[PDB]
């Protein structure tokens, strides 16, 4: 077969029922995740190869960065609750990994203020039980797959992308192989 278990993807031994159709995990501390966002735009290119309106879900993880890692999972919940993911993803990645200006929850909040989220609006969300629920959802989804590494993408709770088994001499070719694999898996 052109697509083979163990090559472009692996099959979960314990599939996860009722999972999101396309589920990505990342950390703002994760170096390949930085590439996946700013250099490769993996999520956008996957979406462009899937049918219109299909659910893509993207969740932050706790297991990198200690205290701040957990603050970032909560901030991602705020971003999802307010719908401002596209406004804060790049400045959070660059503040953690490029300028290293994010050292505290207050620095995370500054990114949202600078992106135009009002202070009262950010603080109300940060402390909301709706956001507590979104944090729990992010934790539960990672726990469902005993997630120990990012970037990770899961398709229908059954298949895990294997980018290590793709060619990376050409960055566009890699993105295309990755997106085409998600499409193939989604059609299984």
Please give the residue ranges that form the binding site for ligand O6Y (CB under 6 A): 32, 35, 39-40, 149-151, 163-164, 168, 171, 174
Of 141, 131, 37, nearest to 76 (Cα)?
A: 131
Report the relative pairing of strands 56-60 and 22-26 from DSSP bridges: parallel
Beta carbon nearer to ligand O6Y, 36 or 112 = 36
Question: In this structure, what token pair is assigned to residue 54?
Answer: 């299909």
Q: Nearest distance from residue 127's CB to ligand O6Y, in Å?
A: 32
Give the H/E segment covering residue 26. strand 22-26
Q: Nearest distance from residue 30's CB to ligand O6Y, in Å?
A: 7
Beta carbon nearer to ligand O6Y, 33 or 102 = 33
Of 74, 149, 147, nearest to 104 (Cα)?
A: 74
Beta carbon nearer to ligand O6Y, 151 or 157 = 151
Q: Nearest distance from residue 86's CB to ligand O6Y, in Å?
A: 21
Question: In this structure, what token pair is assigned to residue 81?
Answer: 């609750």
Beta carbon nearer to ligand O6Y, 6 or 53 = 6
Beta carbon nearer to ligand O6Y, 61 or 108 = 61
- The SS3 assignment for 123 reads helix
Place of tokens 């077969």: 1
Give the H/E segment covering residue 23. strand 22-26
Strand partners, 4: none
Q: Nearest distance from residue 68's CB to ligand O6Y, in Å?
A: 18
Q: Nearest distance from residue 188's CB to ligand O6Y, in Å?
A: 22
Nearest residue (beta carbon) to ligand O6Y: 149
Cβ contact 182:4 at 8 Å: no
């Amino acid at each position: 077969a052109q697509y083979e278990d163990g090559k472009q993807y692996t099959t979960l031994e314990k599939p996860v029922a009722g999972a999101p159709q396309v589920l990505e995990f990342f950390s703002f501390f994760c170096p390949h995740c930085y590439q996946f966002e700013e250099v490769l735009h993996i999520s956008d290119n996957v979406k462009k190869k899937l049918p219109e309106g299909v659910k893509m879900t993207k969740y932050h993880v706790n297991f990198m960065g200690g205290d701040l890692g957990k603050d970032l999972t909560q901030a991602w919940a705020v971003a999802m609750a307010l719908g401002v993911e596209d406004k804060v993803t790049v400045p959070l990645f660059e503040g953690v990994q490029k300028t290293q200006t994010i050292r505290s929850a207050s620095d995370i909040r500054d990114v949202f203020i600078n992106a135009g989220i009002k202070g009262e609006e950010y603080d109300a969300a940060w402390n909301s039980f709706v956001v507590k629920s979104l944090v729990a959802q992010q934790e539960k989804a990672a726990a469902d797959v005993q997630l120990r590494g990012v970037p990770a993408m899961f398709v229908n709770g059954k298949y895990q992308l294997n980018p290590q088994g793709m060619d990376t001499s050409n960055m566009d070719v890699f993105v295309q192989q990755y997106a085409d694999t998600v499409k193939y898996l989604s059609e299984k």
